């Protein structure tokens, strides 16, 4: 499945779910609590793919800095991708 860690710059996508990386995943839990839920749009604002980290992503009107390991928990719908040019 495509994850947020692979979302190209200036591109939005619809969140499908947030998958635990391991048992009792506090990071995954925190992401869900912050708005990363099925049906909501998330966009890659800066850094990543390429460039490096952190990945600056936006949900609603709030921006978060995520390591690739953190963004990889968020599964997005690849066919919902749209370039915000």
Q: Residues comprising the binding site for Zn(2+)?
A: 6, 22, 53
Tokens 């939005």 locate to 12
Pick the binder of a second copy from 39, 52, 61, 83 (CB under 8 A): 52
The four Cα atoms 9, 12, 45, 68 give a dihedral, to 10 degrees, of: -80
Q: Which of 12-20, 31-39, 41-49, 61-69 is the region at the interface with Zn ion (rule: CB under 5 A)? A: 61-69
Pick the binder of a second copy from 29, 38, 63, 67 (CB under 8 A): 67
Residue 18: C-alpha distances to residues 14, 36, 68 (Å): 12, 7, 14
Is residue 27 near a second copy by the rule CB under 8 A? Answer: yes
Alpha carbons 83 and 85: distance in angstroms, whole number: 6
Pick the binder of Zn ion from 10, 63, 67, 84 (CB under 5 A): 67
Q: Which residues of the shown chain bind Cl ion in the complex (CB under 5 A)? A: 25-27, 67-70
């Amino acid at each position: 499945a495509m994850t947020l860690s692979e979302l190209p710059l200036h591109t939005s996508a619809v969140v499908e779910s947030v998958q635990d990386l391991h048992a009792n995943d506090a990071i995954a839990r925190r992401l869900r609590e912050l708005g990363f839920v099925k049906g909501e749009e998330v966009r890659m604002v800066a850094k990543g793919p390429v460039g490096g980290e952190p990945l600056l992503v936006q949900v609603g009107f709030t921006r978060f800095a995520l390591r690739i390991s953190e963004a990889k928990r968020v599964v997005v719908d690849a066919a919902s991708q749209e370039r915000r040019a």
